[PDB]
Symmetry: C3
Amino acid sequence: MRIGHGFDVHAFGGEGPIIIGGVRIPYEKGLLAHSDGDVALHALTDALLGAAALGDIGKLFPDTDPAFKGADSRELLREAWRRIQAKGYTLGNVDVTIIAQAPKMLPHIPQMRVFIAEDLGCHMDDVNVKATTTEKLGFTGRGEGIACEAVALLIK
Amino acid sequence: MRIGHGFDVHAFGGEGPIIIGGVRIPYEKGLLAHSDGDVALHALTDALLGAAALGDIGKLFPDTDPAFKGADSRELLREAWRRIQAKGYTLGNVDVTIIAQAPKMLPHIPQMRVFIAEDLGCHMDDVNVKATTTEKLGFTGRGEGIACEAVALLIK
Amino acid sequence: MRIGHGFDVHAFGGEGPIIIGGVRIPYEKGLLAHSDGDVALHALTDALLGAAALGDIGKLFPDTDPAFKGADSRELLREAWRRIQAKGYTLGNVDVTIIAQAPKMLPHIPQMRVFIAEDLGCHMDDVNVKATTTEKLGFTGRGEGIACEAVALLIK
Ligand SMILES: Nc1ccn([C@@H]2O[C@H](COP(=O)(O)OP(=O)(O)OCCOC(=O)c3ccccc3N)[C@@H](O)[C@H]2O)c(=O)n1
Ligand SMILES: Nc1ccn([C@@H]2O[C@H](COP(=O)(O)OP(=O)(O)OCCOC(=O)c3ccccc3N)[C@@H](O)[C@H]2O)c(=O)n1
Ligand SMILES: Nc1ccn([C@@H]2O[C@H](COP(=O)(O)OP(=O)(O)OCCOC(=O)c3ccccc3N)[C@@H](O)[C@H]2O)c(=O)n1
Ligand SMILES: CC(C)=CCC/C(C)=C/COP(=O)(O)OP(=O)(O)O
Ligand SMILES: [Zn+2]
Ligand SMILES: [Zn+2]
Ligand SMILES: [Zn+2]
């Protein structure tokens, strides 16, 4: 078995909905990256890549690589998973912690787990997603952005 | 085996001692929200539940449900642990990282480990608890709150 | 197998370079502690000690004790690893997440991996190091300090 950790942060900016764990949530602010800014999926991708000793999202999808520029986070996840599986890895389980003061993540989590399990080719039970606030403290608590932590266990 | 990740934050507020890992530690301020404010045990709870894909502490014990209203974090842990064991899981080991500038945790950690080991029905050697400051940086470093990280490895 | 989690933050201060994963990186600022301030190696050390249930880089090396005074983080890592192996543990794998806006960690990562692999006496494929920004948010995003998350898996 192999352990991986991922951490990601995206700042608010613009309007439109945000996308967390592949799920569109309505919010007064959008998430500025060039990513879609799926904090949950990027942190998960890093947790998975890190468990496979394949580096991170940046190493696999560099700015000077036209293939995945403008691709959504799920596409990046599936590709990362593809290269992880090519190395001989199977999915143990994943656990994702969304750190956000707002919006409320809870009702949207079931569909995140569905989306993640589809992309990783696994069951509901292998994917856990949870949310928490920083009790109005820090940059997350001041509503400046959303953080996310993810761990992943892989089998070879 | 299965991994989970817990992360909790509680702001400083009021008087009395703080409760960390079941241990009441003398401090100038208390810890606020809901239950006794045990960031250590809530994060530990979330990590264990996250490993069992049972969501989080807030999912088992919602705001609305009066059943768990007024219960301390050790009671919440033992109940969460009961739900986890009812799913067929046993404990591999746990690691808790208390993120606080003060107060000093180090004298109280041996006692934290004892309480946790009893609540999870495991050996002391299966329980690790540690502390780190953020070197006066962030909300923890400014003494605004205590963060807590936790990881758990379950067996099935 | 046993899980471990490490976390560390160090504030910027003085002149460069900074040392991250045993690698001196040119930067406008340095890192304050009376260590070399290696957040990566301290978080890794804590992750490993945590997995072994040996406490932390503080219980093992007291600030009061002048025995390990002036020691660099690689020496502390190797000593921690010696004591961990003395408990009968070997290395599964490690994953390290440097949380920093700057400097760019990417061209120094392979070196960190090599140093960590030599210090832990393991294969390079057993060591993963990654870096992430906080999108200019928090103390890391403002260039006040550097955080690091680490996870370890040990075998007995
Ligand atoms: N101190 C640092 C911080 C980061 N890095 C490298 O830059 C890369 C990008 O850093 P980031 O800004 O923290 O991560 P990212 O989420 O990529 O932020 C940019 C917006 O997101 C993306 O555009 C994106 C997301 C997933 C995959 C590819 C992407 N380009 C990291 O993956 C890492 O390899 C580095 O070398 N040194
Ligand atoms: N962005 C977010 C942030 C949080 N949440 C949900 O709200 C819950 C509480 O969020 P929090 O405000 O960050 O947690 P905290 O105050 O630390 O409280 C822990 C939750 O446990 C309880 O609610 C509880 C504890 C003891 C007795 C009764 C309780 N209801 C989370 O567990 C999560 O399910 C969410 O859905 N989206
Ligand atoms: N709330 C807390 C926070 C930390 N601690 C203990 O302090 C120790 C150190 O915590 P820290 O100060 O946050 O981490 P560290 O990176 O070790 O601090 C700076 C390192 O530079 C040094 O000062 C140093 C390091 C090694 C040997 C001598 C040194 N002077 C922890 O391992 C823990 O045992 C604690 O008991 N309670
Ligand atoms: C999500 C993680 C890894 C939390 C632990 C690190 C920490 C205590 C950051 C402080 O918050 P902050 O940087 O938001 O404080 P501020 O922005 O107020 O300086
Ligand atoms: Zn991202
Ligand atoms: Zn809590
Ligand atoms: Zn340190």
